[PDB]
Design a protein around this ligand. Structure first.
Ligand SMILES: CC(=O)c1csc(NC(=O)C(C)(C)N)n1
Length: 129
Protein backbone atom coordinates (compact mmCIF):
# COMPACT_ATOMS: atom_id res chain seq x y z
CA UNK A 1 0.00 0.00 0.00
CA UNK A 2 0.94 3.68 -0.22
CA UNK A 3 0.04 4.14 3.46
CA UNK A 4 1.86 0.91 4.38
CA UNK A 5 4.92 2.18 2.52
CA UNK A 6 4.69 5.39 4.57
CA UNK A 7 4.91 3.44 7.81
CA UNK A 8 7.95 1.41 6.69
CA UNK A 9 9.57 4.69 5.64
CA UNK A 10 8.86 6.01 9.13
CA UNK A 11 10.42 2.86 10.58
CA UNK A 12 13.63 3.27 8.56
CA UNK A 13 14.02 6.91 9.54
CA UNK A 14 13.75 5.81 13.18
CA UNK A 15 16.24 2.96 12.75
CA UNK A 16 18.63 5.36 11.02
CA UNK A 17 18.50 7.93 13.82
CA UNK A 18 19.00 5.25 16.50
CA UNK A 19 21.80 3.60 14.53
CA UNK A 20 23.58 6.88 13.96
CA UNK A 21 23.69 7.29 17.72
CA UNK A 22 25.29 4.03 18.59
CA UNK A 23 27.80 4.83 15.83
CA UNK A 24 28.90 8.27 17.12
CA UNK A 25 29.47 6.99 20.67
CA UNK A 26 33.20 6.52 21.37
CA UNK A 27 32.48 3.30 23.28
CA UNK A 28 31.11 1.67 20.10
CA UNK A 29 33.64 2.95 17.54
CA UNK A 30 34.88 -0.67 17.25
CA UNK A 31 31.40 -1.73 16.09
CA UNK A 32 31.05 0.99 13.42
CA UNK A 33 32.90 -0.54 10.45
CA UNK A 34 33.72 -4.09 9.28
CA UNK A 35 36.81 -5.49 10.98
CA UNK A 36 39.93 -4.66 8.99
CA UNK A 37 41.18 -7.74 7.07
CA UNK A 38 44.78 -6.85 7.90
CA UNK A 39 44.41 -5.56 11.47
CA UNK A 40 42.62 -8.67 12.74
CA UNK A 41 43.49 -11.59 10.43
CA UNK A 42 41.81 -14.48 12.28
CA UNK A 43 38.35 -12.89 12.66
CA UNK A 44 36.88 -14.51 9.52
CA UNK A 45 38.13 -17.70 11.17
CA UNK A 46 35.65 -18.08 14.04
CA UNK A 47 32.93 -15.47 13.25
CA UNK A 48 30.67 -16.73 10.46
CA UNK A 49 28.22 -13.81 9.99
CA UNK A 50 30.03 -10.52 10.49
CA UNK A 51 27.74 -7.64 11.41
CA UNK A 52 28.46 -3.98 12.12
CA UNK A 53 26.68 -0.65 12.41
CA UNK A 54 27.59 0.47 8.87
CA UNK A 55 26.18 -2.79 7.46
CA UNK A 56 23.07 -2.16 9.54
CA UNK A 57 22.63 1.25 7.91
CA UNK A 58 23.00 -0.38 4.49
CA UNK A 59 20.39 -2.99 5.36
CA UNK A 60 17.96 -0.22 6.30
CA UNK A 61 18.55 1.75 3.10
CA UNK A 62 18.02 -1.53 1.18
CA UNK A 63 14.63 -1.94 2.98
CA UNK A 64 15.78 -5.14 4.73
CA UNK A 65 14.16 -4.34 8.11
CA UNK A 66 10.34 -4.41 8.20
CA UNK A 67 10.00 -4.46 11.99
CA UNK A 68 12.06 -3.36 14.98
CA UNK A 69 12.44 -6.99 16.03
CA UNK A 70 14.28 -7.65 12.77
CA UNK A 71 16.55 -4.68 13.43
CA UNK A 72 17.29 -5.81 17.00
CA UNK A 73 18.22 -9.27 15.78
CA UNK A 74 21.16 -7.59 14.05
CA UNK A 75 22.20 -5.60 17.13
CA UNK A 76 21.97 -8.87 19.08
CA UNK A 77 24.25 -10.37 16.44
CA UNK A 78 26.85 -7.62 16.80
CA UNK A 79 26.89 -8.10 20.58
CA UNK A 80 26.80 -11.89 20.19
CA UNK A 81 29.64 -11.73 17.64
CA UNK A 82 31.78 -9.69 20.04
CA UNK A 83 31.19 -12.02 23.00
CA UNK A 84 32.08 -15.02 20.84
CA UNK A 85 35.25 -13.48 19.38
CA UNK A 86 36.35 -12.19 22.80
CA UNK A 87 35.63 -15.04 25.26
CA UNK A 88 38.85 -14.87 27.31
CA UNK A 89 39.36 -13.43 30.79
CA UNK A 90 41.91 -10.87 29.48
CA UNK A 91 41.24 -7.16 30.01
CA UNK A 92 41.15 -6.76 26.22
CA UNK A 93 38.35 -9.28 25.88
CA UNK A 94 36.44 -7.82 28.82
CA UNK A 95 36.56 -4.23 27.53
CA UNK A 96 35.12 -5.39 24.20
CA UNK A 97 32.38 -7.56 25.76
CA UNK A 98 31.37 -4.71 28.05
CA UNK A 99 31.10 -2.36 25.10
CA UNK A 100 29.08 -4.97 23.19
CA UNK A 101 26.51 -5.38 25.96
CA UNK A 102 26.35 -1.61 26.39
CA UNK A 103 25.54 -1.45 22.67
CA UNK A 104 22.74 -3.98 23.18
CA UNK A 105 21.44 -2.27 26.33
CA UNK A 106 21.50 1.19 24.72
CA UNK A 107 19.71 -0.03 21.57
CA UNK A 108 16.94 -1.74 23.59
CA UNK A 109 16.72 1.15 26.06
CA UNK A 110 16.39 3.71 23.25
CA UNK A 111 13.58 1.71 21.62
CA UNK A 112 11.76 1.10 24.91
CA UNK A 113 11.71 4.82 25.67
CA UNK A 114 11.04 6.12 22.16
CA UNK A 115 9.24 3.59 19.94
CA UNK A 116 5.51 3.48 20.52
CA UNK A 117 4.50 -0.12 21.12
CA UNK A 118 1.61 0.36 18.67
CA UNK A 119 3.90 1.54 15.89
CA UNK A 120 5.86 -1.69 16.25
CA UNK A 121 2.58 -3.64 16.36
CA UNK A 122 1.48 -2.08 13.09
CA UNK A 123 4.84 -3.00 11.55
CA UNK A 124 4.40 -6.65 12.54
CA UNK A 125 0.80 -6.86 11.31
CA UNK A 126 1.79 -5.47 7.90
CA UNK A 127 4.78 -7.82 7.67
CA UNK A 128 2.67 -10.78 8.84
CA UNK A 129 0.01 -9.85 6.25
C1 LIG B 1 34.38 -6.34 16.49
C2 LIG B 1 35.03 -7.18 17.59
O1 LIG B 1 34.38 -8.03 18.21
C3 LIG B 1 36.33 -6.97 17.82
C4 LIG B 1 37.10 -6.21 17.02
S1 LIG B 1 38.69 -6.22 17.67
C5 LIG B 1 38.28 -7.23 18.97
N1 LIG B 1 39.06 -7.67 19.97
C6 LIG B 1 40.40 -7.85 19.85
O2 LIG B 1 41.04 -7.67 18.81
C7 LIG B 1 41.16 -8.29 21.12
C8 LIG B 1 42.32 -9.19 20.72
C9 LIG B 1 41.71 -7.04 21.77
N2 LIG B 1 40.30 -8.98 22.09
N3 LIG B 1 36.97 -7.52 18.88
Amino acid sequence: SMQEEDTFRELRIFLRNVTHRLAIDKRFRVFTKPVDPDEVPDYVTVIKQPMDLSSVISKIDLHKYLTVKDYLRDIDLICSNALEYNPDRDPGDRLIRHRACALRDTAYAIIKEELDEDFEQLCEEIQES
